[PDB]
């Protein structure tokens, strides 16, 4: 976000994408799909997609993360609050679904 370069920005976004996806694979293999850590990886990946200008994928990841956490943590939790805040920031700033 802070760097003004474009090639460096794209390379760093791709590196963060590789790190997030490898971490998600490790958590998903050792924990399963229905856990809070896997959903946190989903939410972080959605935030990165929002930074990567992939807003459709960003909202898909955020929706999946919110569904996983709401199914597990219930309709009210601090992590669920963070996830819905991230999705709201995606909607009201990028996808313009006010």
């Amino acid at each position: 976000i802070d760097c003004h370069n474009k090639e460096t920005e794209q390379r760093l976004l791709q590196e963060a994408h590789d790190l997030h996806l490898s971490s998600l694979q490790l958590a998903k293999k050792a924990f399963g799909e229905f856990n809070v850590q896997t959903a946190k990886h989903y939410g972080n990946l959605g935030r990165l997609y929002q930074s990567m200008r992939k807003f459709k994928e960003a909202e898909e990841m955020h929706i999946k993360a919110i569904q996983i956490k709401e199914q597990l943590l219930g309709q009210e939790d601090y992590e669920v609050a963070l996830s819905v805040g991230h999705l709201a920031s995606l909607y009201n700033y990028d996808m313009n679904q006010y």
Partner: peptide, 7 residues
């Protein structure tokens, strides 16, 4: 920073 802190 357009969004809240990371999870």
């Amino acid at each position: 920073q357009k969004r809240a802190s990371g999870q």
